[PDB]
Design a binder for these strands. Structure first.
Ligand SMILES: [Mg+2]
Ligand SMILES: [Mg+2]
Ligand SMILES: [Mg+2]
Ligand SMILES: [Mg+2]
Ligand SMILES: [Mg+2]
Ligand SMILES: [Mg+2]
Ligand SMILES: [Mg+2]
Ligand SMILES: [Mg+2]
Ligand SMILES: [Mg+2]
Ligand SMILES: [Mg+2]
Ligand SMILES: [Mg+2]
Ligand SMILES: [Mg+2]
Ligand SMILES: [Mg+2]
Ligand SMILES: [Mg+2]
Length: 74
RNA sequence: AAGGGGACCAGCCUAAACCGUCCGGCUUGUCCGGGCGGGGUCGUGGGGCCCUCGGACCGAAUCCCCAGCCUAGCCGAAG
């Protein structure tokens, strides 16, 4: 069973990673402990949506630097 | 059972893509979900979206009217 880690987990994976676990481990441990969520298509895109936002919002912060950098230093 | 001969005769609505819209969620958005409306319904495959061309017939199983029919009856020849 594929799930999306919501946390870093020992020898499983880092947050946002999609890994294969036994259906039982997910159903009766991971899911009700909020440590992960099932790797369905509905929230697969919802995952990608925020990787994308985090991607954009990061590079906007870098663009602000180079604008501020080229202004000063020159 | 197919086939042949007859009785009767009729074909339709959706799901999904895509658009809209109201709400809900916090994992903040080009988000996810639930409603609702639009769209679409096919096997020669059909539909969706993007270009080019073209701009009235058909009609209900629903509703309305009516005829007819039913639920009482009546006239009816000649010792
Ligand atoms: Mg037959
Ligand atoms: Mg026959
Ligand atoms: Mg026929
Ligand atoms: Mg519809
Ligand atoms: Mg909706
Ligand atoms: Mg709909
Ligand atoms: Mg419709
Ligand atoms: Mg329609
Ligand atoms: Mg239609
Ligand atoms: Mg064919
Ligand atoms: Mg086609
Ligand atoms: Mg009809
Ligand atoms: Mg009499
Ligand atoms: Mg008499």
């Amino acid at each position: 069973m594929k799930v999306i880690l919501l946390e870093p987990l020992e020898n499983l994976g880092d947050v946002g990673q999609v890994v294969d676990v036994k259906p039982g481990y997910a159903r009766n441990y991971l899911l009700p402990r909020g440590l992960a969520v099932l790797a369905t298509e509905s929230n697969l895109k919802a995952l990608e949506a925020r990787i994308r936002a985090q991607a954009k919002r990061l590079a906007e912060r870098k663009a602000e630097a180079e604008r501020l950098k080229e202004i000063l230093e020159n």
